[PDB]
Structures are given as C-alpha cells and as structure tokens.
Amino acid sequence: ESEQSEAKGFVEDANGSILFRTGYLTRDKKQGAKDTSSVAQSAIVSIESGFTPGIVGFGVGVVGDGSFKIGENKNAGNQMIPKHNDGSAYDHWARGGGSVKARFSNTTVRYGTQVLDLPVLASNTGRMVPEYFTGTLLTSHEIKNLEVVAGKFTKDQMSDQINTDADASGRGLDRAIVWGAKYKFNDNLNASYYGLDSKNALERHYANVNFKQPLANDSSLTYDFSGYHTKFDANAHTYSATGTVAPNYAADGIAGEEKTNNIWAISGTYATGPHSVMLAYQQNTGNVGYDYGQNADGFQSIYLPNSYMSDFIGNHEKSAQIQYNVDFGKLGVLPGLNWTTAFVYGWDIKVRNVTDDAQEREFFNQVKYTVQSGFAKDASLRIRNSYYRASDAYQGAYIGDTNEWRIFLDIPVKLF
C-alpha cells in the first residue's frame, strides 16, 4: 500500500557502505599565477537504519568521512584539502554527523546532517568528500512518479572545511528554505522546478525539461532545457557584477545592491550503438554572472551542460559545446571502459570596467574504467584532463590559462 506500511524494521531494512576515494588534482598555470596540487585519501561513510514498523516509522542516519593528505601538499587548493591559517595543508581531518527520520505513508522527514542534491542547493561530490548540510528535509512521494520536497537548512559544511558551518569561503549559512517538485510524465518526458530562498543572500529558481525521442536501431535523441534565475541580495557576495556597485566591491565582493542573473541551456544528444554526440548552448543575461557557491548555496548547484573545469558562467557569457562519448564495452573492446571528449567555447563575457568581449575555451578528455565483476565490482578509475585558455581580461577574474589533471580511484564497500 505505502512505503511505511512495507517497513520491515530498524535492523532489517538497514544499509551501510563506505567509499574509499583516492584523489589527485593539479592545475599548472602560466608564470605569475599560482599552481595547485592536491593529493589525498578519504573514507566516506553512509549508514541508514531502516524504519521501525507502525503508522509512523522512525530511524536514524549517519554520514561522515575521515581523510589524510598524501605528500606535503604545500600548494593544495580547489576545495580538496582543508588549510590552516598559514596556508599549510591539514595532515588529517574528519567531518559529518547524524540525523533522525520519520516516515508516514509515502512521506519522509529527516532532521540533521545530510548530503543534498536539489538543483538549487546541491552538495559537492566532485572532490574528496561530500559537502554536508544541517537542517530538515521533507520528501513526499504521495503521488506516483511525483516527488515534492520542502526543507530548511541552517548549516553548510563544505568539503575542505573542518568547522560545521563553513562554505568554500569559510562563511556560515544563515537560513536556506527550499522547495520544489519533479515529475515523470511518461518514460520519455520529465520536468522539474525548484526554489531556494536564502536569508540575506539570494533567491534562486531552477526549471528543467527533458525529452527523449526513440529512433531506429537502438538510438535516440534526447533534448534538455535547463535554467536558473537568481536574485542576489544587496549584501550578498558576488565577483562578476556590472553596473552600479559599491566602492569596495573590488575588495568585499559586496555589491550593495541587488543583482540578477538568468542562465539557461539547451542540449541535444544523439545516441546510437556504442556512440553519443551532444551539442549544447548556454547563455547568461542580467547584470551578474551565475556566481554560484559564494553564499553557502551549494558548491554543486550548477545543473547545466557547459560545465567542466570552467562553468561558462560569466556575466553575459554565451557558450557552445560539442561532446563525443564512446562506450568501449558496446563497441566490443573492454566492458566498463568509457571515453568522453568535449570542446566548449565561451564569449561575450563582460568584465567590469575592462571589456564586453572576453572569451574562454576548454578542451576536455576523460577516460573512465569501472570494474564489471569479481571482488572489486563497481570500483572505478577516472582520469581527466582540461586544456583551458581565456583572453587577457579573464585570467585572475576567473581561473586563468590552465592545464588541469584529475585522477580519482573510488572503491565502494558494502557494510550491510
């Protein structure tokens, strides 16, 4: 009848796992700019009790991680490793917490520490360890194929922070209220719409529609339209704003008046047999770029296609991508080996008091291998490289010319 009426018990329905992750991320930049290199090992735990049986069910959750750096890591960065006040890397660190949860019919409420994946407020999961939020999330599946959420969060703990309320910049969350809904219309079409209101910081909405269109020979075309609307509060932190800013914006990141961004993107992917190709276009309008991640708003709150090392989020920036993906298992060469190559070109970037015409481009390659069977099933290795270049005006204003490598070994282990 419902998710709660099928509860087996606190112990019977429990699940638990650890992900061991070894990472390496380096960025080589031109002379006069800072090279980063970060190497580390993590163990990331997730434990979820089942729910007790009855009209209302109860359980608990635990999330956390413990990590150590590998090497001195004197020029660590990129949100890989916590740093002491002098700049030195932390030798080892530990983070996380617990939650309690309650379930009635098909609705769950969770209170405490948790990893979020709302498009408007999404935890980092692309570095060593996950970003954690603390607060309350209600999740309702009372209508088949519809998920509705509502939440309130008061702490944000980013991956490279030891303090329990500290985003990528070391600043705490005041109050983030979130809501939204996601619906599967049929097997080819779904859509979503989410909202965020974060006190003294910003208001943000996200919408998506995703339509898959079957073609002959086990082929298809998938179209995607995604976008965000963000209104940044006068006291929020931003970096790409244009128009009227405060004298000190330069130094503070505080515009002292509201700034608005719209960013949207359309993508079409043709897939056939072993092979896929995607084309995508993305554009920003308003008087700021998509300056996400600067106000305890989720380091991964970037559900758009033109997003690799650069996110193509500059003020007025337009961008276009071509992407090619091969599955080497379907092709008959090596099951679980995949290759992605992409090229993204961005232009029309406004850099305040310098130009209206800056540009950037990125050439990306990733090879990934996932173990298909045996004791190490689902272990994977991801090796990825970005060759990134930008005009003179978009160097220290954003990332700067760079050759980036990232390597991640992920070894998942089921505890129960």
PDB file of N, CA and C in Angstrom, residues 9 52 61 96 107 114 126 128 132 141 147 167 172 181 192 221 225 241 290 312 320 340 348 351 360 376:
ATOM      1  N   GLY A   9      11.771  -3.168   9.510  1.00  0.00           N
ATOM      2  CA  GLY A   9      12.350  -2.911  10.804  1.00  0.00           C
ATOM      3  C   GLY A   9      13.625  -2.143  10.745  1.00  0.00           C
ATOM      4  N   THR A  52      11.326   1.808  11.836  1.00  0.00           N
ATOM      5  CA  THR A  52      10.514   0.923  12.660  1.00  0.00           C
ATOM      6  C   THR A  52       9.095   0.776  12.027  1.00  0.00           C
ATOM      7  N   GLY A  61      20.163   8.158  10.667  1.00  0.00           N
ATOM      8  CA  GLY A  61      21.234   8.120   9.658  1.00  0.00           C
ATOM      9  C   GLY A  61      22.559   8.667  10.188  1.00  0.00           C
ATOM     10  N   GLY A  96      31.326  15.120   9.736  1.00  0.00           N
ATOM     11  CA  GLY A  96      29.999  14.578   9.414  1.00  0.00           C
ATOM     12  C   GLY A  96      29.083  14.696  10.651  1.00  0.00           C
ATOM     13  N   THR A 107       5.698   9.711   2.858  1.00  0.00           N
ATOM     14  CA  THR A 107       6.433  10.969   3.168  1.00  0.00           C
ATOM     15  C   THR A 107       7.453  10.838   4.267  1.00  0.00           C
ATOM     16  N   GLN A 114      23.171  15.973   6.422  1.00  0.00           N
ATOM     17  CA  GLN A 114      22.827  15.243   5.242  1.00  0.00           C
ATOM     18  C   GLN A 114      23.443  15.770   3.983  1.00  0.00           C
ATOM     19  N   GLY A 126      32.295  16.303  -6.068  1.00  0.00           N
ATOM     20  CA  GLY A 126      33.360  16.110  -7.129  1.00  0.00           C
ATOM     21  C   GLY A 126      34.806  16.321  -6.621  1.00  0.00           C
ATOM     22  N   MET A 128      37.175  15.461  -2.597  1.00  0.00           N
ATOM     23  CA  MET A 128      37.497  14.243  -1.800  1.00  0.00           C
ATOM     24  C   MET A 128      36.310  13.664  -1.038  1.00  0.00           C
ATOM     25  N   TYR A 132      28.207  18.823   3.386  1.00  0.00           N
ATOM     26  CA  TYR A 132      27.082  18.491   4.275  1.00  0.00           C
ATOM     27  C   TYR A 132      26.248  19.646   4.605  1.00  0.00           C
ATOM     28  N   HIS A 141       6.377  11.401  -1.635  1.00  0.00           N
ATOM     29  CA  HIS A 141       6.006  10.646  -2.781  1.00  0.00           C
ATOM     30  C   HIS A 141       4.570  10.190  -2.692  1.00  0.00           C
ATOM     31  N   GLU A 147       7.780  13.618  -7.001  1.00  0.00           N
ATOM     32  CA  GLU A 147       8.477  13.910  -5.781  1.00  0.00           C
ATOM     33  C   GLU A 147       8.420  15.390  -5.433  1.00  0.00           C
ATOM     34  N   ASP A 167      31.185  27.422   4.348  1.00  0.00           N
ATOM     35  CA  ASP A 167      31.143  27.123   2.903  1.00  0.00           C
ATOM     36  C   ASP A 167      32.561  27.222   2.351  1.00  0.00           C
ATOM     37  N   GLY A 172      29.487  31.078   7.148  1.00  0.00           N
ATOM     38  CA  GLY A 172      28.387  30.161   7.581  1.00  0.00           C
ATOM     39  C   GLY A 172      27.081  30.395   6.854  1.00  0.00           C
ATOM     40  N   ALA A 181       9.533  20.324  -6.995  1.00  0.00           N
ATOM     41  CA  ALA A 181       8.833  19.143  -7.401  1.00  0.00           C
ATOM     42  C   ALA A 181       9.491  18.660  -8.687  1.00  0.00           C
ATOM     43  N   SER A 192      11.077  19.405 -13.950  1.00  0.00           N
ATOM     44  CA  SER A 192      11.253  19.856 -12.537  1.00  0.00           C
ATOM     45  C   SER A 192      11.374  21.310 -12.331  1.00  0.00           C
ATOM     46  N   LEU A 221      17.368  10.404 -29.514  1.00  0.00           N
ATOM     47  CA  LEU A 221      17.681  11.783 -29.390  1.00  0.00           C
ATOM     48  C   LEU A 221      17.098  12.261 -28.109  1.00  0.00           C
ATOM     49  N   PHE A 225      16.235  21.210 -21.736  1.00  0.00           N
ATOM     50  CA  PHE A 225      16.194  22.673 -21.488  1.00  0.00           C
ATOM     51  C   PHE A 225      16.242  22.879 -20.004  1.00  0.00           C
ATOM     52  N   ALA A 241      29.772  41.175 -11.063  1.00  0.00           N
ATOM     53  CA  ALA A 241      28.649  42.104 -11.233  1.00  0.00           C
ATOM     54  C   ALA A 241      29.046  43.234 -12.114  1.00  0.00           C
ATOM     55  N   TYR A 290      26.475  33.863 -13.222  1.00  0.00           N
ATOM     56  CA  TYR A 290      25.937  32.796 -12.373  1.00  0.00           C
ATOM     57  C   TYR A 290      26.981  32.498 -11.260  1.00  0.00           C
ATOM     58  N   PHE A 312      31.466  28.363 -17.456  1.00  0.00           N
ATOM     59  CA  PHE A 312      30.809  29.177 -18.573  1.00  0.00           C
ATOM     60  C   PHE A 312      29.645  30.006 -18.028  1.00  0.00           C
ATOM     61  N   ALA A 320      29.054  27.382 -26.397  1.00  0.00           N
ATOM     62  CA  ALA A 320      28.621  26.306 -27.275  1.00  0.00           C
ATOM     63  C   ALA A 320      29.578  25.148 -27.092  1.00  0.00           C
ATOM     64  N   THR A 340      35.128  10.220 -22.952  1.00  0.00           N
ATOM     65  CA  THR A 340      34.386  11.423 -23.248  1.00  0.00           C
ATOM     66  C   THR A 340      35.384  12.466 -23.702  1.00  0.00           C
ATOM     67  N   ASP A 348      31.558  36.835 -25.345  1.00  0.00           N
ATOM     68  CA  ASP A 348      30.627  37.888 -24.849  1.00  0.00           C
ATOM     69  C   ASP A 348      30.707  38.070 -23.293  1.00  0.00           C
ATOM     70  N   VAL A 351      33.629  41.933 -18.305  1.00  0.00           N
ATOM     71  CA  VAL A 351      34.499  42.028 -17.140  1.00  0.00           C
ATOM     72  C   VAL A 351      34.509  43.508 -16.862  1.00  0.00           C
ATOM     73  N   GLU A 360      36.673  32.402 -23.556  1.00  0.00           N
ATOM     74  CA  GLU A 360      37.383  31.296 -22.985  1.00  0.00           C
ATOM     75  C   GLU A 360      37.068  30.034 -23.790  1.00  0.00           C
ATOM     76  N   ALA A 376      36.005  -6.725  -6.652  1.00  0.00           N
ATOM     77  CA  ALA A 376      36.114  -5.273  -6.710  1.00  0.00           C
ATOM     78  C   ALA A 376      35.083  -4.648  -7.662  1.00  0.00           C
TER      79      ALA A 376
END
